[PDB]
Amino acid sequence: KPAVSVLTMFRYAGWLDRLYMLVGTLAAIIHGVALPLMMLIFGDMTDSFASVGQVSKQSTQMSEADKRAMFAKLEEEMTTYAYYYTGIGAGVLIVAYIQVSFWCLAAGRQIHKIRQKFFHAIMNQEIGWFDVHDVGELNTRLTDDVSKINEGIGDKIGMFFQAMATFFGGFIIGFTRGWKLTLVILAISPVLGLSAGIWAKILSSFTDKELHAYAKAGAVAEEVLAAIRTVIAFGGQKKELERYNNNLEEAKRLGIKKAITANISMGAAFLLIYASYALAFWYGTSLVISKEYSIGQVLTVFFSVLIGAFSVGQASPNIEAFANARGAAYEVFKIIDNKPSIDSFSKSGHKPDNIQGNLEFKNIHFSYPSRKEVQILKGLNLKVKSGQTVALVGNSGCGKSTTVQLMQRLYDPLDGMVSIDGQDIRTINVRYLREIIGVVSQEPVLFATTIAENIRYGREDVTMDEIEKAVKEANAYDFIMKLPHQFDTLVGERGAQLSGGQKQRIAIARALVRNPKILLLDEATSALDTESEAVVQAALDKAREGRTTIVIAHRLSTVRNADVIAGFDGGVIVEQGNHDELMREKGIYFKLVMTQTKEALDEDVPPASFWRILKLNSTEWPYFVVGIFCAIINGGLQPAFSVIFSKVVGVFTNGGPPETQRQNSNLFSLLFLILGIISFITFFLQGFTFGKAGEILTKRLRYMVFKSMLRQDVSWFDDPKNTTGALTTRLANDAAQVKGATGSRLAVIFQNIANLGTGIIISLIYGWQLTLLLLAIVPIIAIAGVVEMKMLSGQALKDKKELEGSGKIATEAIENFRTVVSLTREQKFETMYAQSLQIPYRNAMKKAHVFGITFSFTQAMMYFSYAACFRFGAYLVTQQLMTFENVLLVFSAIVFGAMAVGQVSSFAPDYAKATVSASHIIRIIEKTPEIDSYSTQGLKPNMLEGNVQFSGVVFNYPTRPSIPVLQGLSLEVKKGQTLALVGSSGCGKSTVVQLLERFYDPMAGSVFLDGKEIKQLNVQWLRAQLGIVSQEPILFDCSIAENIAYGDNSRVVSYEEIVRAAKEANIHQFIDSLPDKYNTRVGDKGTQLSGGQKQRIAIARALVRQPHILLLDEATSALDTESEKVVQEALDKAREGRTCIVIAHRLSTIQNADLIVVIQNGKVKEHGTHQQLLAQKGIYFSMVSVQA
Ligand SMILES: CC(C)[C@@H]1NC(=O)c2c[se]c(n2)[C@H](C(C)C)NC(=O)c2c[se]c(n2)[C@H](C(C)C)NC(=O)c2c[se]c1n2
């Protein structure tokens, strides 16, 4: 992975920028040392209570002379301590403000330039650059990578500096107050980073093992959901359910172990930090007995070294964000500092005013930059006189278009020169070059705006009258005036779709506005019907007036009209001259003449569900039984600690017997270790409980989901919100993430309720008033913690919603770069881009200020809490209310309690995302379709007859109930005879074939098979005797023998039936010939096949089950040569003795069909055989007339 030098990355920072960064970082440093200072002050605080405990403990000394020496002393010490706390806090709000504010600011300002210059630099690039580069990733790079470099030069490094400042402040204060203790603790430190470092590698080892573990089931998951039509139709729902399931009990059972080891990681972390607590206090408390360190000093250094330690662990992502922001900056600055071969932005060439317009190509050798290996033009020589029109032909290769492309100087030739008049095309400014060159491409392209605006894109300073005139010159004025909004009518991608001819004509006009003296037509008439081609070419021929035109037309119809016809054999020009010369020479021209004669949309919709999801995992009670208890234990562990820490520092603050100072000390210290041991037990138990549950719950769930997915209707798979990829992603992720809302959430809620719940009881008994204070301040701070992330993500989505404006402009500009580069107008699109960006950047100031005041409001009172609680508590202890140790207990219990609930909240997966990934699962499972392929009811007669009779049957698609497809059309087919369907297009050419296979239910009316109604029959058994052949036959990546046997399921097909079905599908020839027999895989994983053979296999598939009803729906549309012969030849020998229905557009193999039904609109208007309908001279006469 690549990365920029740190110095290079801030290149677009200026005066004010460096200023902001420096001021900010400076405030970040001092914000950093605020916490260690806080620690020291805390030590100095506890030292003071330690003095008043011991004297009033032992016996009785002076009753009236204690209130003066103890009570009066402490208040005098706390009135100043308060000033310290509060002082530091008040400073902290300011300096934190400066930090986030300035860093966010300077970052934003930089980024604004960065994105702009990235865009301009993308525009600057020639097309040769867009050949070698994917435009999709480039356009997303302008949004993703720039937003990615925004993060890493902003708040993140501010916090990095705060963090390193806390590291240095903490270790400095550490060693200053305490030489030894800090070295003890720092001695303990390398055993936690060595522990966190091996356990991350362990969890991450299984994480990527899982990705390619489930991807075996995901394969057959997308394989099924893609070919789902061919699945339900061959009823392989059972087999595919099984097949999918066999790859589940191998890839989540792999996950079980990983869940366990990650749980043991957590356990070991806890055991280790608790070991650290134990050892540190065992040292320090025995150290305060020898009267070396004070009790408060031990606290000071333990806490400042500890805080200084976790500083690193909360600097890690802040420095990581800086790192990969450099790696993203690489790609962007590469383009910005890249100057192309064709610029194409500034003028350095000439701008002839003659301007003549004589073309010349001398010895042109050229090859595309994507594939230098293959040479395109070899010694290309071609002159074009003024006003003369030259057509390019020969059907050689790309070369044709290449010349056109070379003419507007998209690329440059490898050898040889392209000269307009006396000067080379390279000696003239490129902007002015494409201003004097107009172009019409094979595919028209209109930008999303008004027609007027699309026209402006050819020339900016054009009056409305010039516009109208230009439109008229394009024979386009007519249909534009017929539009509802005239010249303000929307076009392009979204809104108001226009035909290809009109769309092309507007482009013709656009080009015409430029008034070029040279005109290039690359397959202008191509890809158009014969009725619009006339009008379009009418505009073109009038556009060729006064202009030097070179035209390439696949249709040589409009070619003869040219002055000079130039043929292409290979890379060289061979035959050149007038039409008659090339006809007489019988060249290549003569040859050709004779031969041609959704992500948000998903999660928005579902309502529900509050805790019903737990019913899903309820299949295993034991695991949850152990689980919940284990969490109550690990949850009571935390309040325990706060008590035990308060008894450690209590035995030296509340005085008493010195001989018992040790006995207590080592007891509590050792006790901490015990509290760690048990802590390692819970987490080893939890991952064996919830861990397996949530994983079992995963497997089973997926199974259920997949099953239900096969139950569904065909209408559901027509739903624009349910795609093979979206479905398989619903199966892959949401199905696994469901475990978040079950066990994990019980763990969380129980650990939290155990912690803050019991801790609040204890802090309530050890203090009435102070507890009331903390259960008041703490929630208020917690509320601020929510709003902090509310106003953070809140104006994070609002900022992207105003940024989509820029996104659209850039997108439209990039996706059609190859088009805009021809109309120049690159700088215009840049201008649009900046104009779009001027609104979010004006909101960067307010943004930075907001993040400032928010971060500062949350962070300020994080010190004012200590300020309040320790002042009120001192107020307690000094008076008759007791004591201080209890004050410290209430504080630690409630505060680290509330902190612990936060960390427990951060451990488990996101409950919101879990629930919304759960509701899709539960809805998908409990989903009952109309047509149930799983039902075991049904007639199942012995009657092998098989008469299809549609009566009435009015049907319209549920996906889009607009313009009903079937309007109650009726027909009937008896046994052996073959129906045929004739109409303008599909619907209901295919709709019938679908309704007989019962993919949909017609609104009113009924279709009968034999004497019985379809709806009365068994659903599955109905398709058991119906073979189906679609336009594009799909096979399964399993094997050939299975593909063939896939036709008749629930039965042992074996060698015999497969060879029998192979031999009449005539495919048996292709089988032995190609190594090897029946074991070969189709397709794209094994050997590739042509459509013909694959469809032959497909027929052989629909032939195994011995169907009494064939359904042929536009069988082969892409099959040519003598391949379509053997296909229908194999079709004809299996058609006899079978009820068949054929839909084709061929109309050549329908003359031999038994019944021919001409369906139009929503009914049947013609009926009978071929010659009968033909002699009827209706619409069948007019449709079979286009066969010449
Ligand atoms: C200044 C520090 C001493 C302060 N500790 C406490 O406030 C505390 C003292 Se016992 C305790 N927390 C409980 C007990 C019940 C284990 N543990 C957790 O809540 C917990 C669950 Se995951 C986790 N921590 C992670 C890592 C393990 C990944 N680490 C921290 O969050 C962290 C970083 Se600094 C710090 N904590």
UniProtKB/Swiss-Prot annotation:
Tree of life domain: Eukaryota
Principal subcellular localization: membrane
Residues in compartment: Cytoplasmic: 105-153, 204-261, 320-624, 691-745, 788-847, 909-1188
Residues that bind ATP 1: 394-401
EC number, UniProt record: 7.6.2.2, 7.6.2.1
ABC transmembrane type-1 domain residues: 21-324, 624-913
Family of this protein: Belongs to the ABC transporter superfamily. ABCB family. Multidrug resistance exporter (TC 3.A.1.201) subfamily.
Function statement: Translocates drugs and phospholipids across the membrane. Catalyzes the flop of phospholipids from the cytoplasmic to the exoplasmic leaflet of the apical membrane. Participates mainly to the flop of phosphatidylcholine, phosphatidylethanolamine, beta-D-glucosylceramides and sphingomyelins. Energy-dependent efflux pump responsible for decreased drug accumulation in multidrug-resistant cells.
Name the UniProt record assigns to this protein: ATP-dependent translocase ABCB1
GO cellular component: apical plasma membrane; brush border membrane; cytoplasm; intercellular canaliculus; plasma membrane
Gene Ontology annotations of biological process type: cellular hyperosmotic salinity response; cellular response to alkaloid; cellular response to antibiotic; cellular response to borneol; cellular response to dexamethasone stimulus; cellular response to estradiol stimulus; cellular response to external biotic stimulus; cellular response to L-glutamate
Topology in membrane: Multi-pass membrane protein
Transmembrane segments: 15-37, 84-104, 154-175, 183-203, 262-283, 298-319, 625-645, 670-690, 746-766, 768-787, 848-870, 887-908
Extracellular side, ranges: 38-83, 176-182, 284-297, 646-669, 767, 871-886
PANTHER family: ATP-BINDING CASSETTE SUBFAMILY B MEMBER 1 (PTHR43394:SF28), ATP-DEPENDENT PERMEASE MDL1, MITOCHONDRIAL (PTHR43394)
Keyword Amino-acid biosynthesis included in the entry's annotation: no
Any one GO molecular function term: ATP binding
Note: In mouse the MDR gene family includes three or more related but distinct cellular genes.
Catalytic activity from the UniProt record: ATP + H2O + xenobioticSide 1 = ADP + phosphate + xenobioticSide 2; ATP + H2O + phospholipidSide 1 = ADP + phosphate + phospholipidSide 2; a 1,2-diacyl-sn-glycero-3-phosphoethanolamine(in) + ATP + H2O = a 1,2-diacyl-sn-glycero-3-phosphoethanolamine(out) + ADP + phosphate + H(+); a 1,2-diacyl-sn-glycero-3-phosphocholine(out) + ATP + H2O = a 1,2-diacyl-sn-glycero-3-phosphocholine(in) + ADP + phosphate + H(+)
Lineage: Eukaryota, Metazoa, Chordata, Craniata, Vertebrata
Subunit structure: Interacts with PSMB5.
Catalytic EC class: translocase
Domain ABC transporter: residue ranges: 359-595, 948-1186
Database matches in SMART domains: AAA
Glycosylation (residues): 54, 58, 61
Residues annotated as binding ATP 2: 983-990
Activity regulation as described: Translocase activity is inhibited by verapamil and is sensitive to energy depletion. C1orf115 regulates drug efflux through modulation of ABCB1 localization and activity.
